[PDB]
Amino acid sequence: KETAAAKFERQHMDSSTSAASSSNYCNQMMKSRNLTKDRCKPVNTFVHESLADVQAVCSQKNVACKNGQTNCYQSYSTMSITDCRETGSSKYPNCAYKTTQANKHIIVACEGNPYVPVHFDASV
Ligand SMILES: [Cl-]
Ligand SMILES: [Cl-]
Ligand SMILES: [Cl-]
Ligand code: NA
């Protein structure tokens, strides 16, 4: 039974690469992080920064989350991210994703002690 912090790491952290360099990145990563077991997760963002740099966002700019909660934080600097989105032809179990690499600010919701990211809200 995964903790919220561990689920965030599994779904969103990829410090092993600086950026997605292939159109197939999302297909491979969505599968290896077990996000296509039982259903295709329709949208997911991976962050290519160190875990410490992403945890540090919980001490940066406090902003509202999309849902109206006030425990969201926007990174002061841009970060390397990859957006993974199902294509229109995708359907379980042959999940298919479009890979879009970008450099953007990230917005995360933080909770707990230690106070760490538990939800990826958006990128700007
Ligand atoms: Cl897993
Ligand atoms: Cl996401
Ligand atoms: Cl402020
Ligand atoms: Na947690």
Instruction: Name the residues around ion ligand 4, CB cutoff 5 A.
Output: 3-5, 112
Residue that the structure tokens 């990826």 belong to? 120
- Domain extent for 61: 1-124
83 Cβ neighbours under 8 A, 6+ residues apart = 43, 45, 99, 100, 101, 102, 123
Q: Is 31 annotated as a binding residue?
A: no
- The dihedral built from the CA positions of residue 15, 17, 21 and 23, taken in this order, carries a sign that is negative
Q: What angle do CA 4, 118, 60 make, to 5 degrees?
A: 150
**Domain total in the chain:** 1
The question of whether 48 is a catalytic residue gets the answer no
Q: Is 114 annotated as a binding residue?
A: no
Residue that the structure tokens 């995360």 belong to? 108
Residue from 47, 72, 119, 121 carrying the catalytic annotation: 119
The question of whether 119 is a catalytic residue gets the answer yes
Centre of ligand 3 to C-alpha 75, Å, is 12
The torsion angles phi and psi of 10, rounded to 5 degrees, stand at -65, -40
